[PDB]
């Protein structure tokens, strides 16, 4: 099985892990407190510290809030060359001077940041998206990483919508707040 990583152990990380397992992946979780977090996951999931989880995969969902991104900054060297999927949402339209994905890309300039899956609710990862709204909006400045995440979305039974460069991340983040 291909291994996919998830950082964090909350509602989104748990829902994502369900969907990844159902669609044939092996999941490794990076948690601040993996002994405690291990009960939030089945035994088939490898729950460990961030620095161990990153050695087991090249594709990592960053299932934490923007305000906690800097808690990962000491991992920068270990994260070089890895794909980081920015799934985050904000409470306000155009909340910060940069989109969350551009902010993550600035923290990890030698990682490959891809925006995606922020429009999918935790409940939709468990049940599946509504048939008229299977779309997941994906973008990145790295074409190869963008295509890898597009293929992952297809394997998770979503319809990937390729919006090109990471400049698209701002309005992808505004979309849940717009109607
Ligand atoms: N909930 C949802 O339905 C959706 C959420 N999202 C996005 O997914 C991400 C997570 O959302 P959700 O799961 O709801 O958020 P949570 O509030 O559940 O936080 C998730 C994880 O963040 C980690 N965390 C908390 N504080 C820190 C810290 N100081 N340093 C490092 N890691 C920390 C914890 O993991 P640990 O304690 O294991 O380290 C926690 O389990 C957010 O960006 C959110 O916008 C996107 C779409 C839907």
PDB file of C-alpha atoms and ligand atoms in Angstrom:
ATOM      1  CA  UNK A   1       0.000   0.000   0.000  1.00  0.00           C
ATOM      2  CA  UNK A   2       1.087   3.587  -0.725  1.00  0.00           C
ATOM      3  CA  UNK A   3       1.630   5.554   2.504  1.00  0.00           C
ATOM      4  CA  UNK A   4       0.081   9.012   2.905  1.00  0.00           C
ATOM      5  CA  UNK A   5       0.858  11.273   5.861  1.00  0.00           C
ATOM      6  CA  UNK A   6      -1.409  13.503   7.932  1.00  0.00           C
ATOM      7  CA  UNK A   7      -0.181  16.032  10.483  1.00  0.00           C
ATOM      8  CA  UNK A   8      -2.665  16.599  13.311  1.00  0.00           C
ATOM      9  CA  UNK A   9      -5.237  14.362  14.974  1.00  0.00           C
ATOM     10  CA  UNK A  10      -8.489  16.357  15.019  1.00  0.00           C
ATOM     11  CA  UNK A  11     -11.791  16.133  13.176  1.00  0.00           C
ATOM     12  CA  UNK A  12     -10.314  16.695   9.737  1.00  0.00           C
ATOM     13  CA  UNK A  13      -7.315  14.403  10.239  1.00  0.00           C
ATOM     14  CA  UNK A  14      -9.582  11.605  11.491  1.00  0.00           C
ATOM     15  CA  UNK A  15     -12.042  11.974   8.611  1.00  0.00           C
ATOM     16  CA  UNK A  16      -9.255  12.142   6.039  1.00  0.00           C
ATOM     17  CA  UNK A  17      -7.712   8.986   7.523  1.00  0.00           C
ATOM     18  CA  UNK A  18     -11.036   7.128   7.154  1.00  0.00           C
ATOM     19  CA  UNK A  19     -11.289   8.079   3.507  1.00  0.00           C
ATOM     20  CA  UNK A  20      -7.630   7.252   2.780  1.00  0.00           C
ATOM     21  CA  UNK A  21      -8.004   3.775   4.306  1.00  0.00           C
ATOM     22  CA  UNK A  22     -11.299   3.126   2.488  1.00  0.00           C
ATOM     23  CA  UNK A  23      -9.596   4.078  -0.786  1.00  0.00           C
ATOM     24  CA  UNK A  24      -6.628   1.748  -0.302  1.00  0.00           C
ATOM     25  CA  UNK A  25      -3.868   3.794   1.331  1.00  0.00           C
ATOM     26  CA  UNK A  26      -1.778   3.258   4.426  1.00  0.00           C
ATOM     27  CA  UNK A  27      -1.848   6.268   6.772  1.00  0.00           C
ATOM     28  CA  UNK A  28       0.846   7.631   9.075  1.00  0.00           C
ATOM     29  CA  UNK A  29      -0.127  10.383  11.547  1.00  0.00           C
ATOM     30  CA  UNK A  30       2.246  12.986  12.925  1.00  0.00           C
ATOM     31  CA  UNK A  31       1.066  14.189  16.333  1.00  0.00           C
ATOM     32  CA  UNK A  32       2.567  16.269  19.113  1.00  0.00           C
ATOM     33  CA  UNK A  33       1.409  13.560  21.536  1.00  0.00           C
ATOM     34  CA  UNK A  34       1.228  10.272  19.627  1.00  0.00           C
ATOM     35  CA  UNK A  35       0.632   8.106  22.700  1.00  0.00           C
ATOM     36  CA  UNK A  36      -2.479  10.138  23.524  1.00  0.00           C
ATOM     37  CA  UNK A  37      -3.522  10.534  19.881  1.00  0.00           C
ATOM     38  CA  UNK A  38      -3.244   6.799  19.138  1.00  0.00           C
ATOM     39  CA  UNK A  39      -6.732   6.204  20.571  1.00  0.00           C
ATOM     40  CA  UNK A  40      -8.217   8.630  18.030  1.00  0.00           C
ATOM     41  CA  UNK A  41      -7.250   6.138  15.286  1.00  0.00           C
ATOM     42  CA  UNK A  42      -7.482   2.424  14.484  1.00  0.00           C
ATOM     43  CA  UNK A  43      -4.548   0.118  15.054  1.00  0.00           C
ATOM     44  CA  UNK A  44      -3.934  -0.079  11.287  1.00  0.00           C
ATOM     45  CA  UNK A  45      -2.833   3.589  11.414  1.00  0.00           C
ATOM     46  CA  UNK A  46       0.793   4.390  12.348  1.00  0.00           C
ATOM     47  CA  UNK A  47       0.527   7.222  14.917  1.00  0.00           C
ATOM     48  CA  UNK A  48       3.917   8.748  15.715  1.00  0.00           C
ATOM     49  CA  UNK A  49       5.821  11.999  16.177  1.00  0.00           C
ATOM     50  CA  UNK A  50       6.035  14.452  13.268  1.00  0.00           C
ATOM     51  CA  UNK A  51       9.712  13.758  12.602  1.00  0.00           C
ATOM     52  CA  UNK A  52       9.081  10.003  12.319  1.00  0.00           C
ATOM     53  CA  UNK A  53       5.925  10.295  10.207  1.00  0.00           C
ATOM     54  CA  UNK A  54       7.751  12.410   7.613  1.00  0.00           C
ATOM     55  CA  UNK A  55      10.324   9.674   6.967  1.00  0.00           C
ATOM     56  CA  UNK A  56       7.554   7.310   5.838  1.00  0.00           C
ATOM     57  CA  UNK A  57       5.946   9.340   3.043  1.00  0.00           C
ATOM     58  CA  UNK A  58       6.483  12.138   0.555  1.00  0.00           C
ATOM     59  CA  UNK A  59       2.878  13.470   0.612  1.00  0.00           C
ATOM     60  CA  UNK A  60       1.535  15.047   3.799  1.00  0.00           C
ATOM     61  CA  UNK A  61      -1.816  16.661   4.531  1.00  0.00           C
ATOM     62  CA  UNK A  62      -1.283  19.551   6.945  1.00  0.00           C
ATOM     63  CA  UNK A  63      -4.458  19.030   8.995  1.00  0.00           C
ATOM     64  CA  UNK A  64      -3.857  21.843  11.478  1.00  0.00           C
ATOM     65  CA  UNK A  65      -4.903  25.498  11.562  1.00  0.00           C
ATOM     66  CA  UNK A  66      -2.848  28.281   9.956  1.00  0.00           C
ATOM     67  CA  UNK A  67      -2.140  29.825  13.352  1.00  0.00           C
ATOM     68  CA  UNK A  68      -0.154  26.703  14.338  1.00  0.00           C
ATOM     69  CA  UNK A  69       1.961  26.311  11.180  1.00  0.00           C
ATOM     70  CA  UNK A  70       5.036  27.766  12.896  1.00  0.00           C
ATOM     71  CA  UNK A  71       5.031  24.890  15.377  1.00  0.00           C
ATOM     72  CA  UNK A  72       6.359  22.838  12.432  1.00  0.00           C
ATOM     73  CA  UNK A  73       9.129  25.279  11.465  1.00  0.00           C
ATOM     74  CA  UNK A  74      11.861  23.248  13.156  1.00  0.00           C
ATOM     75  CA  UNK A  75      10.993  20.413  10.723  1.00  0.00           C
ATOM     76  CA  UNK A  76      12.025  22.503   7.685  1.00  0.00           C
ATOM     77  CA  UNK A  77      15.140  20.488   6.859  1.00  0.00           C
ATOM     78  CA  UNK A  78      13.270  17.180   7.124  1.00  0.00           C
ATOM     79  CA  UNK A  79      10.437  18.535   4.954  1.00  0.00           C
ATOM     80  CA  UNK A  80      12.641  19.477   1.984  1.00  0.00           C
ATOM     81  CA  UNK A  81      11.260  18.086  -1.257  1.00  0.00           C
ATOM     82  CA  UNK A  82       8.047  16.769   0.286  1.00  0.00           C
ATOM     83  CA  UNK A  83       4.539  17.652  -0.888  1.00  0.00           C
ATOM     84  CA  UNK A  84       2.559  19.523   1.764  1.00  0.00           C
ATOM     85  CA  UNK A  85      -1.185  19.704   1.131  1.00  0.00           C
ATOM     86  CA  UNK A  86      -2.720  22.873   2.584  1.00  0.00           C
ATOM     87  CA  UNK A  87      -6.311  22.009   3.533  1.00  0.00           C
ATOM     88  CA  UNK A  88      -6.889  25.064   5.737  1.00  0.00           C
ATOM     89  CA  UNK A  89      -9.789  27.497   6.005  1.00  0.00           C
ATOM     90  CA  UNK A  90     -10.135  30.921   7.645  1.00  0.00           C
ATOM     91  CA  UNK A  91     -13.087  32.545   9.363  1.00  0.00           C
ATOM     92  CA  UNK A  92     -13.042  35.685   7.197  1.00  0.00           C
ATOM     93  CA  UNK A  93     -12.749  36.416   3.500  1.00  0.00           C
ATOM     94  CA  UNK A  94      -9.255  37.729   2.664  1.00  0.00           C
ATOM     95  CA  UNK A  95      -8.229  37.468   6.313  1.00  0.00           C
ATOM     96  CA  UNK A  96      -4.447  37.797   5.978  1.00  0.00           C
ATOM     97  CA  UNK A  97      -1.971  39.567   3.661  1.00  0.00           C
ATOM     98  CA  UNK A  98      -1.302  36.233   1.927  1.00  0.00           C
ATOM     99  CA  UNK A  99      -3.348  33.104   1.460  1.00  0.00           C
ATOM    100  CA  UNK A 100      -2.742  30.337   3.977  1.00  0.00           C
ATOM    101  CA  UNK A 101      -1.085  28.176   1.326  1.00  0.00           C
ATOM    102  CA  UNK A 102       1.266  30.988   0.292  1.00  0.00           C
ATOM    103  CA  UNK A 103       2.095  31.511   3.959  1.00  0.00           C
ATOM    104  CA  UNK A 104       2.908  27.788   4.318  1.00  0.00           C
ATOM    105  CA  UNK A 105       5.035  27.991   1.156  1.00  0.00           C
ATOM    106  CA  UNK A 106       6.958  30.917   2.683  1.00  0.00           C
ATOM    107  CA  UNK A 107       7.666  28.914   5.859  1.00  0.00           C
ATOM    108  CA  UNK A 108       8.907  25.904   3.848  1.00  0.00           C
ATOM    109  CA  UNK A 109      10.382  27.355   0.645  1.00  0.00           C
ATOM    110  CA  UNK A 110      12.050  24.057  -0.299  1.00  0.00           C
ATOM    111  CA  UNK A 111       8.877  22.029   0.220  1.00  0.00           C
ATOM    112  CA  UNK A 112       6.224  21.698  -2.495  1.00  0.00           C
ATOM    113  CA  UNK A 113       2.964  23.264  -1.254  1.00  0.00           C
ATOM    114  CA  UNK A 114      -0.332  22.297  -2.928  1.00  0.00           C
ATOM    115  CA  UNK A 115      -3.682  23.789  -1.977  1.00  0.00           C
ATOM    116  CA  UNK A 116      -6.483  21.264  -1.855  1.00  0.00           C
ATOM    117  CA  UNK A 117      -9.472  19.706  -0.031  1.00  0.00           C
ATOM    118  CA  UNK A 118     -10.378  22.751   2.076  1.00  0.00           C
ATOM    119  CA  UNK A 119     -13.831  22.731   0.454  1.00  0.00           C
ATOM    120  CA  UNK A 120     -14.540  19.168   1.701  1.00  0.00           C
ATOM    121  CA  UNK A 121     -16.180  18.915   5.104  1.00  0.00           C
ATOM    122  CA  UNK A 122     -15.124  16.290   7.626  1.00  0.00           C
ATOM    123  CA  UNK A 123     -18.604  14.827   7.333  1.00  0.00           C
ATOM    124  CA  UNK A 124     -18.177  14.650   3.536  1.00  0.00           C
ATOM    125  CA  UNK A 125     -14.918  12.721   3.868  1.00  0.00           C
ATOM    126  CA  UNK A 126     -16.802  10.110   5.902  1.00  0.00           C
ATOM    127  CA  UNK A 127     -19.976   9.895   3.820  1.00  0.00           C
ATOM    128  CA  UNK A 128     -18.735  11.094   0.452  1.00  0.00           C
ATOM    129  CA  UNK A 129     -19.495  14.400  -1.247  1.00  0.00           C
ATOM    130  CA  UNK A 130     -22.891  15.148  -2.724  1.00  0.00           C
ATOM    131  CA  UNK A 131     -23.058  13.866  -6.300  1.00  0.00           C
ATOM    132  CA  UNK A 132     -23.443  17.388  -7.714  1.00  0.00           C
ATOM    133  CA  UNK A 133     -20.446  18.735  -5.724  1.00  0.00           C
ATOM    134  CA  UNK A 134     -17.645  16.151  -5.925  1.00  0.00           C
ATOM    135  CA  UNK A 135     -15.221  18.896  -6.893  1.00  0.00           C
ATOM    136  CA  UNK A 136     -11.976  19.615  -5.074  1.00  0.00           C
ATOM    137  CA  UNK A 137     -10.031  22.718  -6.139  1.00  0.00           C
ATOM    138  CA  UNK A 138      -6.273  22.151  -6.413  1.00  0.00           C
ATOM    139  CA  UNK A 139      -3.401  24.499  -7.218  1.00  0.00           C
ATOM    140  CA  UNK A 140       0.389  24.741  -6.829  1.00  0.00           C
ATOM    141  CA  UNK A 141       3.400  26.464  -8.328  1.00  0.00           C
ATOM    142  CA  UNK A 142       4.954  22.999  -8.782  1.00  0.00           C
ATOM    143  CA  UNK A 143       3.312  21.230 -11.720  1.00  0.00           C
ATOM    144  CA  UNK A 144       4.542  17.756 -10.775  1.00  0.00           C
ATOM    145  CA  UNK A 145       3.256  18.054  -7.193  1.00  0.00           C
ATOM    146  CA  UNK A 146      -0.020  19.502  -8.461  1.00  0.00           C
ATOM    147  CA  UNK A 147      -0.514  16.468 -10.700  1.00  0.00           C
ATOM    148  CA  UNK A 148       0.284  14.054  -7.838  1.00  0.00           C
ATOM    149  CA  UNK A 149      -2.383  15.658  -5.652  1.00  0.00           C
ATOM    150  CA  UNK A 150      -4.837  15.674  -8.572  1.00  0.00           C
ATOM    151  CA  UNK A 151      -4.276  11.927  -8.936  1.00  0.00           C
ATOM    152  CA  UNK A 152      -4.749  11.418  -5.186  1.00  0.00           C
ATOM    153  CA  UNK A 153      -8.049  13.310  -5.361  1.00  0.00           C
ATOM    154  CA  UNK A 154      -9.198  10.998  -8.159  1.00  0.00           C
ATOM    155  CA  UNK A 155      -8.252   7.944  -6.089  1.00  0.00           C
ATOM    156  CA  UNK A 156     -10.282   9.333  -3.177  1.00  0.00           C
ATOM    157  CA  UNK A 157     -13.313   9.545  -5.538  1.00  0.00           C
ATOM    158  CA  UNK A 158     -13.351  13.321  -5.944  1.00  0.00           C
ATOM    159  CA  UNK A 159     -13.349  15.321  -9.174  1.00  0.00           C
ATOM    160  CA  UNK A 160     -10.153  17.407  -9.156  1.00  0.00           C
ATOM    161  CA  UNK A 161     -10.446  20.934 -10.560  1.00  0.00           C
ATOM    162  CA  UNK A 162      -6.985  22.161 -11.586  1.00  0.00           C
ATOM    163  CA  UNK A 163      -6.744  25.921 -10.989  1.00  0.00           C
ATOM    164  CA  UNK A 164      -3.088  26.211 -11.900  1.00  0.00           C
ATOM    165  CA  UNK A 165      -0.618  28.224  -9.850  1.00  0.00           C
ATOM    166  CA  UNK A 166      -0.623  28.850  -6.094  1.00  0.00           C
ATOM    167  CA  UNK A 167      -1.990  32.327  -6.788  1.00  0.00           C
ATOM    168  CA  UNK A 168      -5.388  30.563  -6.952  1.00  0.00           C
ATOM    169  CA  UNK A 169      -5.212  29.527  -3.291  1.00  0.00           C
ATOM    170  CA  UNK A 170      -6.607  32.824  -1.969  1.00  0.00           C
ATOM    171  CA  UNK A 171      -9.947  32.561  -3.744  1.00  0.00           C
ATOM    172  CA  UNK A 172     -10.112  28.807  -3.155  1.00  0.00           C
ATOM    173  CA  UNK A 173      -9.879  29.706   0.544  1.00  0.00           C
ATOM    174  CA  UNK A 174     -12.531  32.397   0.148  1.00  0.00           C
ATOM    175  CA  UNK A 175     -14.950  30.039  -1.592  1.00  0.00           C
ATOM    176  CA  UNK A 176     -16.478  28.328   1.517  1.00  0.00           C
ATOM    177  CA  UNK A 177     -17.270  31.805   2.858  1.00  0.00           C
ATOM    178  CA  UNK A 178     -19.089  33.094  -0.249  1.00  0.00           C
ATOM    179  CA  UNK A 179     -22.346  31.130  -1.080  1.00  0.00           C
TER     180      UNK A 179
HETATM  181  N1  LIG B   1     -13.059  20.312  10.598  1.00  0.00           N
HETATM  182  C1  LIG B   1     -13.449  20.397   9.268  1.00  0.00           C
HETATM  183  O1  LIG B   1     -14.556  19.949   8.931  1.00  0.00           O
HETATM  184  C2  LIG B   1     -12.565  20.979   8.294  1.00  0.00           C
HETATM  185  C3  LIG B   1     -11.338  21.464   8.674  1.00  0.00           C
HETATM  186  N2  LIG B   1     -10.501  21.981   7.698  1.00  0.00           N
HETATM  187  C4  LIG B   1      -9.147  22.458   8.022  1.00  0.00           C
HETATM  188  O2  LIG B   1      -8.458  21.359   8.580  1.00  0.00           O
HETATM  189  C5  LIG B   1      -7.501  21.811   9.574  1.00  0.00           C
HETATM  190  C6  LIG B   1      -7.799  21.122  10.927  1.00  0.00           C
HETATM  191  O3  LIG B   1      -9.103  21.389  11.229  1.00  0.00           O
HETATM  192  P1  LIG B   1      -9.662  20.552  12.583  1.00  0.00           P
HETATM  193  O4  LIG B   1      -9.291  19.139  12.425  1.00  0.00           O
HETATM  194  O5  LIG B   1     -11.105  21.008  12.589  1.00  0.00           O
HETATM  195  O6  LIG B   1      -8.777  21.416  13.635  1.00  0.00           O
HETATM  196  P2  LIG B   1      -8.483  20.976  15.228  1.00  0.00           P
HETATM  197  O7  LIG B   1      -8.873  22.207  15.994  1.00  0.00           O
HETATM  198  O8  LIG B   1      -9.130  19.681  15.472  1.00  0.00           O
HETATM  199  O9  LIG B   1      -6.823  20.939  15.346  1.00  0.00           O
HETATM  200  C7  LIG B   1      -6.396  19.875  14.592  1.00  0.00           C
HETATM  201  C8  LIG B   1      -5.018  19.461  15.096  1.00  0.00           C
HETATM  202  O10 LIG B   1      -4.132  20.572  15.175  1.00  0.00           O
HETATM  203  C9  LIG B   1      -3.051  20.073  15.972  1.00  0.00           C
HETATM  204  N3  LIG B   1      -2.546  21.154  16.739  1.00  0.00           N
HETATM  205  C10 LIG B   1      -3.218  21.960  17.652  1.00  0.00           C
HETATM  206  N4  LIG B   1      -2.406  22.903  18.208  1.00  0.00           N
HETATM  207  C11 LIG B   1      -1.165  22.659  17.603  1.00  0.00           C
HETATM  208  C12 LIG B   1       0.065  23.269  17.756  1.00  0.00           C
HETATM  209  N5  LIG B   1       0.200  24.324  18.622  1.00  0.00           N
HETATM  210  N6  LIG B   1       1.142  22.851  17.059  1.00  0.00           N
HETATM  211  C13 LIG B   1       0.931  21.780  16.203  1.00  0.00           C
HETATM  212  N7  LIG B   1      -0.174  21.087  15.944  1.00  0.00           N
HETATM  213  C14 LIG B   1      -1.233  21.569  16.694  1.00  0.00           C
HETATM  214  C15 LIG B   1      -3.595  18.924  16.921  1.00  0.00           C
HETATM  215  O11 LIG B   1      -2.988  17.803  16.585  1.00  0.00           O
HETATM  216  P3  LIG B   1      -1.971  17.015  17.839  1.00  0.00           P
HETATM  217  O12 LIG B   1      -2.677  17.465  19.095  1.00  0.00           O
HETATM  218  O13 LIG B   1      -2.206  15.608  17.385  1.00  0.00           O
HETATM  219  O14 LIG B   1      -0.568  17.574  17.589  1.00  0.00           O
HETATM  220  C16 LIG B   1      -5.108  18.937  16.537  1.00  0.00           C
HETATM  221  O15 LIG B   1      -5.576  17.646  16.557  1.00  0.00           O
HETATM  222  C17 LIG B   1      -7.715  23.345   9.677  1.00  0.00           C
HETATM  223  O16 LIG B   1      -6.797  23.985   8.791  1.00  0.00           O
HETATM  224  C18 LIG B   1      -9.151  23.522   9.157  1.00  0.00           C
HETATM  225  O17 LIG B   1      -9.413  24.775   8.598  1.00  0.00           O
HETATM  226  C19 LIG B   1     -10.884  21.944   6.332  1.00  0.00           C
HETATM  227  C20 LIG B   1     -12.071  21.500   5.941  1.00  0.00           C
HETATM  228  C21 LIG B   1     -13.062  20.993   6.895  1.00  0.00           C
END
